[PDB]
Design a protein around this ligand. Structure first.
Ligand SMILES: Nc1ncnc2c1ncn2[C@@H]1O[C@H](COP(=O)(O)OP(=O)(O)OP(O)(O)=S)[C@@H](O)[C@H]1O
Lengths: 184, 160
């Protein structure tokens, strides 16, 4: 029983009492990490649909830009007031779109100091392209790439740009990712 | 111990482009030895992070050519939009491209290729090229009149 997510059992035909049920989910006492769905984040319909368009175009129909040739919209910035549901929407895109999700960028990174973090970051975007259509989320893009008010910078802002300039490759070849930022 | 440069520098190929030297980008022989690359062999040339392009390895003069410099005939630089000073990434190829069965050949300005130039000279250029990917250009082509410059781009090639 140790470390099992839910109590497992071995099926053996004939000896088991199979029973039907109308229940759409498993026994609540299993305390399962239940999926997250658009039936929960509803209340932002039009932007949900626009998000679905922004997942259609780079995942399903990258080929349909090789014709018409023009550079595709392969960077998304989902901004809004704090607590409005941005992180929940990003989470529903992650679980209800069947792309491979490249790991969350986050405010945290090895050292949080220039030079050291520059390679540790590029690795996340190097992981992109190789996998079948993916989605790399860069949530809290104000904490990873701040404004550079007068001189506040490591190197991270220009490092993000220089890497995004290669992440934007696609739809001629390696059109297998889109980046979604979130911000307050 | 000789150190192989990570990135090579594109530069003109003083030799003409009309010859059999379309994809035979001369490479400094020291690099050819240091990378287990045989003469007259195919290898991948491309800008950092980009998908590779096919070139044929031919040995050049040690004294004239510095180590970094890689010389490309102006027909193949136009394949992958290789402008001068574009840093490259030499790697060893492993698959020989199969032969060709059909090629659709384009032009700069839509001039009737049948009416302006002979098929024989075009076939000569194409055969002497050897390996043809879609995207090069054959420039400074003398026409029947001898006073017209029409450049042979190649739109596509299909294998049946
Ligand atoms: N349908 C809904 N629409 C919006 N918010 C909802 C909804 N249902 C529940 N909430 C909750 O509202 C909270 C919104 O939090 P977040 O999505 O993290 O806020 P946010 O917009 O991402 O703000 P931050 O500052 O950027 S972390 C979550 O706990 C949601 O589960």
């Amino acid at each position: 029983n140790l470390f099992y997510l839910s109590p497992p059992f071995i099926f053996r035909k004939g000896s088991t009492h199979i029973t039907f049920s109308k229940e759409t989910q498993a026994n609540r006492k299993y305390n399962l990490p239940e999926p997250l769905s658009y039936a929960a984040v509803g209340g932002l319909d039009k932007e949900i649909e626009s998000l679905k368009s922004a997942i259609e175009i780079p995942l399903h129909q990258p080929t349909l830009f090789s014709s018409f040739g023009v550079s595709p919209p392969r960077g998304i910035l989902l901004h809004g007031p704090p607590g409005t549901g941005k992180t929940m929407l990003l989470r529903v895109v992650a679980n209800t779109s069947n792309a491979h999700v490249l790991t969350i960028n986050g405010p945290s990174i090895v050292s949080k100091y220039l030079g050291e973090t520059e390679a540790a970051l590029r690795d996340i975007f190097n992981e992109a392209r190789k996998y079948q259509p993916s989605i790399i989320f860069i949530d809290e893009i104000d904490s990873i790439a701040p404004n550079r008010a007068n001189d506040d910078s490591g190197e991270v802002e220009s490092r993000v740009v220089a890497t995004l300039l290669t992440l934007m490759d696609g739809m001629g070849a390696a059109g297998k990712v889109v980046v979604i930022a979130a911000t307050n | 111990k000789f150190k192989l440069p990570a990135e090579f520098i594109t530069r003109p190929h003083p030799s003409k482009d009309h010859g059999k030297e379309t994809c035979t980008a001369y490479i400094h022989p020291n690099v050819l030895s240091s990378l287990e690359i045989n003469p007259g062999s195919f290898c991948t040339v491309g800008k950092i992070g980009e998908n590779g392009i096919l070139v044929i390895a031919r040995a050049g003069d040690e004294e004239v050519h510095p180590v970094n410099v890689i010389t490309l005939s102006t027909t193949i630089r136009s394949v992958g939009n290789l402008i001068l000073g574009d840093r490259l990434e030499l790697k060893k190829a492993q698959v020989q491209p199969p032969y060709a069965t059909k090629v659709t050949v384009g032009s700069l300005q839509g001039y009737n290729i049948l009416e302006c130039m002979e098929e024989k000279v075009i076939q000569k250029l194409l055969d002497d090229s050897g390996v043809i990917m879609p995207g090069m250009i054959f420039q400074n082509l003398k026409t029947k009149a001898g006073d017209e410059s029409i450049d042979v781009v190649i739109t596509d090639a299909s294998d049946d």
